[PDB]
Design a protein around this ligand. Structure first.
Ligand SMILES: *[C@@]12=NC3=[C]C([C])=C([C])[C]=C3N([C][C]([O])[C]([O])[C]([O])[C]OP([O])([O])=O)C1=NC(=O)[N]C2=O
Length: 108
């Protein structure tokens, strides 16, 4: 399964991405300069299902893992279907420190 992987910093209030695999930058068209420090939601656009988006929003607030199918757009504006799975990573005191995300392009 060809997949990409990113880390978001839950200690900052809008979960900015702090690490992305080589595949994430090659799949999306975006450089580190335009990804690090930003919330993953820039990948979204006109056809992205707000119902699915909201499922991720809620799981992140409730600190649960979650898995959704989103329509994302590359930097050149072409779309692709992104099967996204976000996992919360907690410290020993139960608090959420990072969210890790695996993304798979499932356009087949
Ligand atoms: C994105 N991947 C991704 C990876 C991680 C680890 C996290 C925490 C989130 C994402 N998102 C979603 C985005 O950050 C945000 O959570 C959602 O837009 C919903 O919340 P908001 O506040 O915006 O309503 C990813 N979103 C994508 O579209 N593509 C991914 O690869």
């Amino acid at each position: 399964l060809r997949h990409t992987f990113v880390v978001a910093d839950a200690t900052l209030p809008d979960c900015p991405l702090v690490y992305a695999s080589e595949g994430f930058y090659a799949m999306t068209g975006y450089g580190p300069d335009e990804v690090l420090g930003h919330n993953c939601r820039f990948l979204q656009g006109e056809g992205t299902d707000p119902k699915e988006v909201q499922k991720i929003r809620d799981a992140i607030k409730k600190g649960e893992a979650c898995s959704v199918r989103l329509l994302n757009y590359r930097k050149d504006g072409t779309p692709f279907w992104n099967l996204l799975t976000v996992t919360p990573i907690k410290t020993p005191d139960g608090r959420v420190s990072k969210f890790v995300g695996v993304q798979v392009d499932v356009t087949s």
